């Protein structure tokens, strides 16, 4: 891999060795290989695969729109979308913006029914929205589990969150927006003025 751009150079040269230094000084990742180098234990899951058609004179020109979430289960997650003509290409485009959109998530405790200082859950109440789905992530006591929906559990689990309570709104069957709204609520944790 050629380290274009310069942030790929320091990542390739070993001048940057941990992913936290990318996020602790506000360095915008522009190449997926920076994530591949710095998070070799990255897992990716296919959240959704919808077939979208565009009408034409001769008929609809189909495409695959795949949604992919990536994460290390240690407070790093990223969700990306890909549109292609073949399913294998669409997932690969999905994983690339998934990796480019990877973000840290602040974890901790804060439920009234818990006292552990572990990163098992979200620290405080957070909310994230995508289109019309509104998702609230509430801190939970340890051992409860993930109390979200199925697609929400994938994104929450990939971010290394163990226990959480949810309060959803809008049409959650729009899986691209439910998944994206769950991603945004995690990413909104860094907008909390501590």
């Amino acid at each position: 891999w050629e380290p274009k751009t310069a942030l790929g150079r320091m990542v390739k040269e070993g001048k940057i060795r941990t992913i936290d230094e990318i996020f602790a000084n506000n360095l915008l990742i522009k190449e997926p290989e920076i994530v591949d180098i710095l998070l070799p234990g990255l897992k990716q899951e296919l959240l959704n695969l919808n077939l979208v058609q565009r009408q034409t004179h001769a008929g609809e020109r189909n495409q695959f729109q795949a949604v992919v979430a990536v994460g290390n289960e240690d407070g790093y997650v990223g969700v990306g979308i890909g549109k292609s003509r073949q399913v294998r290409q669409a997932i690969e485009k999905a994983t690339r913006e998934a990796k480019l959109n990877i973000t840290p998530v602040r974890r901790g405790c804060g439920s009234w029914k818990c006292s552990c200082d572990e990163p098992h859950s979200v620290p405080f109440v957070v909310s994230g929205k995508s289109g019309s789905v509104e998702v609230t992530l509430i801190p939970a006591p340890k051992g409860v589990g993930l109390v979200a929906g199925d697609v929400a559990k994938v994104v929450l689990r990939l971010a290394g969150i163990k226990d959480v309570w949810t309060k959803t709104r809008g049409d959650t069957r729009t899986t691209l927006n439910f998944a994206l709204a769950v991603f945004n609520a995690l990413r909104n944790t860094y907008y909390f003025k501590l």
Partner: protein, 198 residues
């Protein structure tokens, strides 16, 4: 007070002439001096000179290659060339190609740590990529200029040729003195007249 350049030179280039519009932002900041009975806005020349020196201080702390000085206004094409050919910044007169700072797959994909624009209201595409790419911006604002994403501003007449030439000659000179190659009383090999465009 001691001006960087003698006061009859400044008032001959008309640097203290702004557009007849309103800018509630600039007036509260103090960069507006007085409005004439015909409605013309005049800047504070003391604040202009002070901001020129600090601009030279800011530019001198970056490598000369890494600073981008771009304008699309053709009256500033010659001054920005002569500004930096003496300082060696990546001068870019003409169309800022969209994607120059945000598309690394582009053949002209430059990497700069500072950006300098002449008029942000017309050089919007340059400032737009700076906001997205998180690069500091300096600009010669005036009454008509939108102040978005401008980390350092110099309220000066960025429309006239004489004002543009006299401002880039002063700024080109001062950055060398802070950089080192010129003495505190030394001057450039060329006067401001050769900076001006034609």
């Amino acid at each position: 007070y001691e001006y960087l350049v003698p006061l009859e030179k400044y008032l001959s280039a008309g640097v203290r002439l702004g557009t007849r519009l309103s800018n509630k932002y600039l007036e509260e900041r103090g960069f507006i001096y007085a409005v004439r009975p015909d409605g013309l806005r005049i800047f504070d020349i003391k604040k202009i000179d002070e901001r020129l020196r600090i601009a030279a201080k800011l530019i001198a702390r970056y490598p000369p290659d890494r600073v981008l000085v771009h304008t699309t206004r053709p009256y500033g094409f010659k001054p920005v060339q002569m500004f930096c050919k003496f300082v060696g910044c990546k001068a870019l007169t003409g169309r800022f190609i969209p994607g120059m700072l945000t598309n690394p797959n582009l053949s002209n994909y430059l990497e700069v740590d500072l950006l300098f624009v002449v008029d942000p209201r017309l050089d919007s595409q340059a400032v737009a990529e700076a906001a997205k790419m998180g690069i500091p911006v300096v600009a010669l604002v005036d009454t008509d200029t939108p102040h978005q994403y401008i980390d350092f501003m110099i309220p000066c007449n960025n429309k006239g040729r004489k004002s543009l030439a006299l401002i880039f000659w002063v700024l080109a000179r001062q950055v060398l003195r802070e950089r080192g190659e010129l003495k505190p009383d030394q001057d450039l090999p060329v006067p401001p007249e050769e900076f001006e465009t034609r």
